[PDB]
Amino acid sequence: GSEFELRRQQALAEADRTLFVGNLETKVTEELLFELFHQAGPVIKVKIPKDKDGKPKQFAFVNFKHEVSVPYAMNLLNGIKLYGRPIKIQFRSGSSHAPQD
Numbered sequence: 001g002s003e004f005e006l007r008r009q010q011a012l013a014e015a016d017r018t019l020f021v022g023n024l025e026t027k028v029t030e031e032l033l034f035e036l037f038h039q040a041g042p043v044i045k046v047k048i049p050k051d052k053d054g055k056p057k058q059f060a061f062v063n064f065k066h067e068v069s070v071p072y073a074m075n076l077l078n079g080i081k082l083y084g085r086p087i088k089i090q091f092r093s094g095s096s097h098a099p100q101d
């Protein structure tokens with residue numbers, strides 16, 4: 001018994017060119033992200049969401065250089081921060097019945 005209240009599909013993504021980041025801090029910003037992912041390799045752009053209260057809902061996105069055989073940040077960071085809440089990187093890598101080549 002690991003989790004009781006969670007969706008029974010293999011992983012989180014909603015994207016094929018964009019990296020999902022969750023567990024984000026309450027005072028987080030694109031600047032805190034661009035600097036954490038500076039270590040994780042080529043970053044193309046960042047994304048911060050903002051609720052009716054102006055909050056990133058504890059999640060974000062980052063655009064990255066087709067890094068599909070595991071995103072390096074899932075290994076580099078995954079459990080680190082500066083305000084209180086450790087960054088959690090999430091991904092899937094598949095929207096195809098089979099590879100091309």
